[PDB]
Design a protein around this ligand. Structure first.
Ligand SMILES: O=c1[nH]c(CSC2CCNCC2)nc2cc(NC3CCCC3)cc(F)c12
Ligand SMILES: [Cl-]
Ligand SMILES: [Cl-]
Length: 187
């Protein structure tokens, strides 16, 4: 549960890459800084889960990079515990009980998700999520649904709002998503 935080220099190839993807829908926001979260436990759980997904879903590209807006209050919890069950309790439920990730930063940048702190600062993560093989989510899914309702040994990895034109993804467990970068920004 130990972690380090490293601020990225605006001059760093890594900074450019992250800002570039943030600015595809959020260029009208001012970036205050970008930190890399380094949580060795959360990382090793994630890489291990990625290895077994790659052995299992054949040609599927299991890894996506998605945005997660949140309040300042949640940042320490997430940097430590990841996107775990207690955190999942604080998310919406319309597409299932888990943590919600947007394809486009400007979804996450809504004030409902990345609530502005007393100084007007907004917080959005650029998360590695193992979306793997996914299906339409709904409110009743409080665990990953089975492909076959008669066989719970074949589970979907995540759920989405729309399988063929997805806007968001719900992940159920902490080993499925790594909060790699935290973007602090303002209007
Ligand atoms: O990025 C996002 N972060 C969060 C966490 S919000 C919460 C954190 C704890 N403190 C209070 C604020 N939720 C989202 C929900 C989305 N869509 C759902 C809206 C209703 C149906 C689908 C899309 C998103 F991009 C996000
Ligand atoms: Cl797996
Ligand atoms: Cl799973």
């Amino acid at each position: 549960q130990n972690f380090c935080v490293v601020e990225l220099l605006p001059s760093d190839p890594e900074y450019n890459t992250v800002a570039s993807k943030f600015n595809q829908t959020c260029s009208h926001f001012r970036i205050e800084k970008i930190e890399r979260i380094q949580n060795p436990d959360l990382w090793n759980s994630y890489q291990a889960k990625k290895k077994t997904m790659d052995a299992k879903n054949g040609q599927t590209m299991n890894e996506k990079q998605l945005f997660h807006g949140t309040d300042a209050g949640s940042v320490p919890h997430v940097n430590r515990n990841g996107f775990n069950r207690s955190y999942a309790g604080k998310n919406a439920v319309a597409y299932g009980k888990g943590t919600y990730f947007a394809v486009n930063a400007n979804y996450s940048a809504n004030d409902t998700y990345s609530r502005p702190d007393a100084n007007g600062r907004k917080h959005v993560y650029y998360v590695r999520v193992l979306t793997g093989i996914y299906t339409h989510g709904n409110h009743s899914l409080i665990v990953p649904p089975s492909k076959n309702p008669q066989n719970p040994t074949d589970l979907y990895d995540t759920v989405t709002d729309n399988v063929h034109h997805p806007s968001l993804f719900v992940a159920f467990y902490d080993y499925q998503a790594y909060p790699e970068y935290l973007i602090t920004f303002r209007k």
